[PDB]
C-alpha cells in the first residue's frame, strides 16, 4: 500500500488539452468522463513525470496510459516512441485493441510483440520484447515512454530479468509508468531503482453500500413455489434487464432452461466456466442481447452491477457475507424466502442493520 503525493484532479476530458483527433477517439469509443485514475494520472504522464499507480483492474488503467501515450506521440517520427508491457499476450492484445481504437483518427501505428521498426507504439510481453530488442528487430533509440502494466503479475510470472534488461536497453531518459494492483517488495524494488521521484497515485476500490437500493422480499413459503412467483413478477412489473442469483450451479442451469421454455432470453454464469467465457457472457448481456442474467455466488465478486434496475435473490445466500456483493452500490433487490429461509433472512436483517419490507402490491410504479 503506497501513499499519494500528487494533488491535481482533472474531471473532464475537455480539460486535458488533448489533441482533437485523440479526443474524438476517446469519445467515439465510449468514454465520456474520466474515471478516478484517469482524472488523476493522465495529466502527470503527459507532463513527463514517472507515475506509480496502485489500481485494481476495471478502474480505467489501460485508458489512462493509452491516452497519455497517444497525446505524447510525434506522428512525424516513424519509430517506436512508447513501449507498453503486459504479463500475457491476451492482455497485450487487449491493450492493443484499445490503443488502436482511441487512435482511429490519428496516424499512429501500433505493433504487438508476442515490421516493428516503424511502429510508433509497441505492445508486448517482457520476454518476446526483450528477445526482439536483442535481435535488433526494433529500434529503441526513439523510445520516450515505458509503461509496465500489472508489474506484480509480470514479476510473479518470471519476468524480472527481462524487465531489468529492458530498462537498461532504453534511452536513459525514458519516462516510466508503472501500474500494479499490489505493491509488494519485489515491485517496490523496480520502483526505487528505475523510477525518478514518481507521482504516486493510489486508487482504492469504493466500498459497497445498501443505501442506494430498495430491498424487498416475497414469502414463497415453499421451494416448489419459487418459479411460479418469478413468472408472476414478470406479469406485474416492467423490467429492462435483471440479474438472478442462485446458490448452486445446478439451480442456475435448471432455472436457466426453465425460463427459456417460457420464451425468456437468459444468460447463465457459474464458477467452472473459463474467465474468458464469463467475460463474454457479461459483455453480451450488458449490451442487450439477453434480458436476464442468472449467476451463482462464488462470482458475485467479479461481477459488475451496472445500471441493472432489478436484482432477484432466487436463493438466499448461504453465506451472510455475499448479500452485499449481490446487491450493493439505486435500484431494486427482491429476495425469495421460504418458511425455512425466515431465520436466515433475520440474519441478513441484523448483519447489515438494514430493512427489507415485504413486496407491496404497488410496485409497477416504484
Amino acid at each position: 500500500q503506497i501513499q499519494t503525493n500528487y494533488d491535481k484532479v482533472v474531471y473532464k476530458f475537455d480539460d486535458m488539452e488533448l489533441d482533437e483527433n485523440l479526443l474524438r477517439g476517446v469519445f467515439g469509443y465510449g468514454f465520456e468522463e474520466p474515471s478516478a485514475i484517469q482524472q488523476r494520472a493522465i495529466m502527470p504522464i503527459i507532463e513527463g513525470h514517472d507515475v506509480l499507480a496502485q489500481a485494481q483492474s476495471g478502474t480505467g488503467k489501460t485508458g489512462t496510459f493509452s491516452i497519455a501515450a497517444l497525446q505524447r506521440i510525434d506522428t512525424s517520427v516513424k519509430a517506436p516512441q512508447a513501449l507498453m508491457l503486459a504479463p500475457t499476450r491476451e492482455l497485450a492484445l487487449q491493450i492493443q485493441k484499445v490503443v488502436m481504437a482511441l487512435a482511429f483518427h490519428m496516424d499512429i501505428k501500433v505493433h504487438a510483440c508476442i515490421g516493428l521498426r516503424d511502429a510508433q507504439i509497441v505492445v508486448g510481453t517482457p520476454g518476446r520484447v526483450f528477445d526482439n530488442i536483442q535481435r535488433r528487430r526494433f529500434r529503441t533509440d526513439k523510445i520516450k515512454m515505458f509503461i509496465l502494466d500489472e508489474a506484480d503479475e509480470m514479476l510473479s510470472s518470471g519476468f524480472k530479468e527481462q524487465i531489468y534488461q529492458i530498462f537498461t536497453l532504453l534511452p536513459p531518459t525514458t519516462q516510466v509508468v508503472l501500474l500494479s494492483a499490489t505493491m509488494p517488495n519485489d515491485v517496490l524494488e523496480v520502483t526505487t531503482k528505475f523510477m525518478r521521484n514518481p507521482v504516486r497515485i493510489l486508487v482504492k476500490k469504493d466500498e459497497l453500500t445498501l443505501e442506494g437500493i430498495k430491498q424487498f422480499y416475497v414469502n414463497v413459503e415453499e421451494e416448489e413455489y419459487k418459479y411460479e412467483c418469478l413468472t408472476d413478477l414478470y406479469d406485474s412489473i416492467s423490467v429492462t434487464q435483471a440479474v438472478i442469483f442462485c446458490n448452486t450451479r445446478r439451480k442456475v442451469e435448471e432455472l436457466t432452461t426453465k425460463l427459456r421454455n417460457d420464451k425468456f432470453t437468459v444468460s447463465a454464469i457459474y464458477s467452472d466456466l473459463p474467465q474468458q467465457e464469463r467475460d463474454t457472457i457479461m459483455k453480451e448481456f450488458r449490451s442487450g442481447s439477453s434480458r436476464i442474467l442468472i449467476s451463482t455466488d462464488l462470482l458475485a465478486r467479479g461481477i459488475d452491477v451496472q445500471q441493472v434496475s432489478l436484482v432477484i435473490n432466487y436463493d438466499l445466500p448461504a453465506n451472510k457475507e455475499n448479500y452485499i456483493h449481490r446487491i450493493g452500490r439505486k435500484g431494486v433487490a427482491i429476495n425469495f424466502v421460504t418458511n425455512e429461509d425466515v431465520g436466515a433472512m433475520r440474519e441478513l436483517e441484523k448483519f447489515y442493520s438494514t430493512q427489507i419490507e415485504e413486496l407491496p402490491s404497488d410496485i409497477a410504479t416504484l
Partner: protein, 239 residues
C-alpha cells in the same frame, strides 16, 4: 398491502399483465415467437366493436418503447409486425386491417406527444417525476423516428417532432435534447429530406445548430456530434 402471486377473452388487467410479460421478454433472439404472441392478443379485437384491446396493446407498446429507448427500434419492428399481420376481419366503429393499425399508431403519438414535457430541469421531490417526463418525451421522439423510418408514420408527425425540438434548440438547449436531435437526424435525416417543405425544415434546423456550435458553451463531445451531422448532410450528402 402486500403483493400476491396466484376462443379466449381478456379483461383490461389480464391484457396489461400478459403484455407486461410479453414486452419484458422481447429480445432479438425471441422476437418472432414473442411478436407472434403479442399479435394474438391484438387480434382479440375481432370479437369487439370499438377495437378497445388493440388500442390497449398499441398504447402499451408506446409506454414500453418510451421507457426503454435502447430497444425503441425493436419495438418499432413489433408495430410493423402488427400492422402487417393484423387480422383484416377486424373493425372499429370509430379502416380495417393494416390501415386501421396505422391510424392507431398516429393517434397514439399525438396523444403521447400532446402531454408534452420541459427541456430545462430544476434528487428532489417532484423532481424525479419531471426527469422522467423529459426522459420519456425524448424516448418518444426517438420512437417516432423508428416508426417513421419503417413508413409506419407520415411526415406530418415528423414535422411536429422536429418542430418541438427546434423550439428547445433556440431556448438554451440541454445536452440530452441535442443528443436526441443528432440521433434523430442520423436515423431519419436522409429520408426526411424529401417529404411534404422537408429539406427546407432541415435548412432552418441546421442553422440553429450552426449557431449553437458557434456560440453556445457545450461539451466537446456534443460539439463533435453537431459538426459531424452538419458535414454528413451538407458535404457528404448522407453518403
Amino acid at each position: 398491502n402486500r403483493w400476491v402471486p396466484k376462443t379466449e377473452l381478456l379483461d383490461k388487467d389480464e391484457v396489461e399483465r400478459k403484455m407486461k410479460s410479453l414486452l419484458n421478454k422481447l429480445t432479438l433472439e425471441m422476437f418472432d415467437a414473442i411478436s407472434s404472441e403479442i399479435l394474438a392478443i391484438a387480434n382479440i379485437s375481432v370479437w369487439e366493436t370499438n377495437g378497445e384491446t388493440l388500442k390497449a396493446v398499441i398504447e402499451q407498446i408506446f409506454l414500453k418503447a418510451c421507457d426503454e429507448p435502447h430497444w425503441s427500434s425493436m419495438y418499432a419492428q413489433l408495430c410493423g409486425k402488427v400492422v402487417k399481420e393484423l387480422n383484416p376481419d377486424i373493425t372499429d366503429e370509430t379502416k380495417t386491417g393494416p390501415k386501421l393499425v396505422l391510424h392507431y399508431l398516429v393517434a397514439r403519438c399525438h396523444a403521447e406527444f400532446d402531454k408534452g414535457w420541459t427541456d430545462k430541469l430544476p434528487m428532489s421531490e417532484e423532481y424525479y417525476a419531471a426527469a422522467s417526463a423529459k426522459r420519456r418525451g425524448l424516448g418518444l421522439v426517438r420512437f417516432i423516428g423508428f416508426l417513421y423510418r419503417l413508413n409506419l408514420l407520415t411526415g406530418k408527425m415528423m414535422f411536429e417532432c422536429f418542430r418541438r425540438l427546434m423550439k428547445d434548440l433556440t431556448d438554451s438547449p440541454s445536452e440530452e435534447t441535442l443528443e436526441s436531435v443528432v440521433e434523430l437526424l442520423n436515423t431519419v435525416g436522409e429520408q426526411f429530406e424529401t417529404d411534404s417543405e422537408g429539406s427546407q425544415l432541415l435548412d432552418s434546423l441546421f442553422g440553429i445548430l450552426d449557431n449553437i456550435i458557434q456560440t453556445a458553451k457545450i461539451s466537446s463531445r456534443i460539439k463533435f456530434k453537431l459538426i459531424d451531422i452538419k458535414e454528413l448532410r451538407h458535404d457528404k450528402n448522407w453518403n
